[PDB]
Amino acid sequence: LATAPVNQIQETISDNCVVIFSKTSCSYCTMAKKLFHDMNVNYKVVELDLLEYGNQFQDALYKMTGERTVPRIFVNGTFIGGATDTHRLHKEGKLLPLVHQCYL
């Protein structure tokens, strides 16, 4: 955690409108990816379970967001939450306008 690559997270979330830090084995992550898929907006996934340095990205996510859980969802460079938070935003119609800000 003293050596967590927060700087790398920051590069990824500045370069991509929607970033979902994910694991392939997780249904909450699958539901989060499907939501953006269904919205027909571009999104980047980072499948931490498939990456040699996945554990380092998770240390950084813990440092930045305070939880070592997946998914961790970023929109327009801002952490918006996990799967529950992202679906709550969408239920209230507030997710799509956040994504839109990337293109303004």
Partner: peptide, 12 residues
């Protein structure tokens, strides 16, 4: 678009 659906259809 083509790549998204390629990815997605292989997962789901």
């Amino acid at each position: 678009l083509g790549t998204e659906n390629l990815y997605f259809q292989s997962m789901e």
